[model samples]
Target: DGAIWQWRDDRGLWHPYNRIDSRIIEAAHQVGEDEISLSTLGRVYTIDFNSMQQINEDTGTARAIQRKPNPLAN
Candidate 1:
């Protein structure tokens, strides 16, 4: 199953069991040298592989990614 997956850093080492809730891994983005952003089915996880710790979790729905202009006259 794809429930659990390992991430190897620049050091070529696998980070074991460093997930949020063992949910489905949909996307992965490297934020910094020792930080990674992981998105799952339930929530998003910001983890630091350096110490195998969770930085933050965001379960809120998607917010403003762009801005819209208002009508001049209605």
Candidate 2:
């Protein structure tokens, strides 16, 4: 899958990711097959293609809900 061509640069470590960024697509590297690491957003993941556990330093257990198409407009 083309999703395999994404990555994040941190602490001199290139963590292979699937979250695409057109600006840095050229900087991406492959970690071989069946690898895993956290995304740029700090979300934990399994390298087998976006198996995020949804556990992170910034997010809580509460599920985020979309209020409406433009709920805040009112």
Candidate 3:
């Protein structure tokens, strides 16, 4: 059994994990928007920026259109 016991603060260095802490788990969930989250070979993950914004009613991200310059604009 290769289990990595950790707190986000100590980051796998300290021991005693997965027993469920009342305090630590709550704070870690709010970690950075720009931060990297990870997954393993058994799992896959993706985030859709447009879809997330659309769900949150961010009309600018949802309704915007993009196009190339007109080829023969004279």
Candidate 4:
């Protein structure tokens, strides 16, 4: 199976992962790997991936949704 990439808004200071930034998004999309990080909300999330689903070439907007699941219990 493939990996899923997630996005995050770092205190609104940094751009959300998988955002539509032409330069960065384009570069990222070209690559097919991303990293995972812990958000301020105390959740483990995947970093934005350039190769994730994209809305437009000029805009690096990812077509992925973020969800927080209960890890402690099912």
Return the top candidate by lDDT.
1
- Each prediction's Cα lDDT score? 0.41, 0.31, 0.26, 0.36
Single out the weakest 10-residue window by summed lDDT for candidate 4.
1-10
True-vs-predicted CA distance for residue 6, candidate 4, Å: 9.7
**Lowest-scoring 10 consecutive residues by lDDT in candidate 1?**
61-70
Output the lDDT of residue 4, model 2. 29
Reference-based TM-score of each model: 0.31, 0.22, 0.17, 0.23
What is the total number of backbone clashes in candidate 2? 2
Whole-model lDDT for model 2 versus the true structure?
A: 0.31
What's the CA RMSD of model 4 in angstroms? 13.0
Model 2, span 1-74: residue lDDT tens? 23324333334333443335311232222343333333564464333322322223354332111111212322
- Give the best candidate by TM-score: 1
Sort order, lDDT high to low: 1, 4, 2, 3
Candidate 3 per-residue lDDT over residues 1-74, each given as its tens digit:
12222322223233233323212222333352322222333432222223221111222222111112223433
Clashing pairs in 3: none
Candidate 3 has what TM-score?
A: 0.17
| Candidate with the larger TM-score of 1 and 4 | 1
Q: What RMSD value applies to candidate 1?
A: 16.0
Clashing pairs in 1: none
